[PDB]
Amino acid sequence: AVPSPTGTSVKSKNFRTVLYWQYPSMSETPHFVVEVKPYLSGKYQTVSTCVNISATSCDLSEEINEIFHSYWFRIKAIVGSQQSQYVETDEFVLQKHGKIGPPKLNLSRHGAEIIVDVYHPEFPSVEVRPWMREIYSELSYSVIFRNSENESRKNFTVADCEMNECNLSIPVPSEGSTYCVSAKGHFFDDLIVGASSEESCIWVPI
């Protein structure tokens, strides 16, 4: 009949969460309805921005305001005067399923001191998502300092960064060589751990 959507997938990265699905080719153009089941009510409700849409995706970022509790989502298809039944996604928990991509990392020096600026431009503004303040209060970055030509490797952590923008100064032993640095985001120490940035390297003279 009017089959249900297929291949449901919730993809969450850097707090942008999007639901995707696929649909068979029909004579005309199907539209879809997406619902969300929040943990508190334990009942499905309509995702307003995703009713009667032709797209096979739905941005859920505004429906998710809990990082530890579960959400379910579901989609039905509308084809002419006919509807499919809903198909439900896997359980979704932001803390478990949400990915944190590599941070943006800038590397400079003042004399023999290396300066690391690290942040995630993708993270949403706290002013636009006030529920995020609590989460950002737990944001930290771990930074790995490597000297190949030497060849050593220490670890640093920076937190309580204003506007989620962290800066770190680091003393370089010596000091005619090259140092390479990478970083990862952390939320709640190790409950959420992001991918490493690629290495940035810099020369520090004597």
Side-chain angles (χ1 to χ4, degrees):
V2 162
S4 77
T6 205
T8 67
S9 178
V10 180
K11 303 293 288 205
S12 179
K13 183 126 118 213
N14 292 157
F15 298 101
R16 185 72 72 164
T17 305
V18 194
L19 168 71
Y20 301 101
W21 55 96
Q22 289 174 318
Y23 203 73
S25 188
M26 295 307 174
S27 333
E28 267 138 311
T29 47
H31 294 75
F32 305 103
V33 183
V34 179
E35 299 192 313
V36 54
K37 174 162 66 151
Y39 96 99
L40 268 175
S41 59
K43 289 151 165 41
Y44 279 101
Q45 71 184 54
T46 248
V47 181
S48 62
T49 52
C50 298
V51 184
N52 297 334
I53 53 163
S54 64
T56 46
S57 65
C58 175
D59 186 356
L60 304 174
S61 301
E62 299 295 294
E63 303 287 332
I64 297 170
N65 43 64
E66 295 289 343
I67 206 163
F68 297 116
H69 300 296
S70 300
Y71 287 89
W72 282 264
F73 312 95
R74 71 181 180 181
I75 315 120
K76 66 172 170 178
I78 309 171
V79 164
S81 44
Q82 277 180 85
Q83 290 192 5
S84 75
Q85 307 289 13
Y86 276 115
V87 53
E88 192 168 85
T89 62
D90 294 337
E91 172 174 6
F92 174 87
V93 183
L94 186 62
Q95 174 271 316
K96 295 172 56 182
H97 306 305
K99 286 197 212 179
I100 298 296
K104 184 61 180 178
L105 190 156
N106 189 235
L107 202 57
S108 58
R109 68 179 177 90
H110 168 235
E113 102 187 54
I114 309 288
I115 297 170
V116 179
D117 289 288
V118 58
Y119 81 124
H120 270 89
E122 314 101 322
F123 288 174
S125 163
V126 98
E127 273 100 34
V128 177
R129 285 181 195 160
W131 79 270
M132 285 292 305
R133 191 165 300 157
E134 169 168 31
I135 307 317
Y136 289 144
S137 81
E138 300 288 346
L139 172 63
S140 64
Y141 289 94
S142 56
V143 182
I144 298 182
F145 233 69
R146 270 130 101 99
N147 155 64
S148 114
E149 3 229 284
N150 232 38
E151 22 256 330
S152 47
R153 213 255 194 97
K154 280 190 177 185
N155 302 310
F156 300 89
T157 304
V158 61
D160 307 312
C161 309
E162 248 75 84
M163 269 164 314
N164 301 329
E165 299 173 310
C166 307
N167 164 291
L168 188 63
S169 274
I170 298 181
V172 136
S174 101
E175 66 164 14
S177 26
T178 300
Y179 292 82
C180 304
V181 82
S182 66
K184 286 194 258 207
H186 283 81
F187 285 97
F188 304 96
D189 299 323
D190 288 341
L191 297 189
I192 307 181
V193 190
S196 309
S197 60
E198 46 180 307
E199 279 203 335
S200 281
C201 299
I202 189 183
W203 171 270
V204 162
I206 284 118

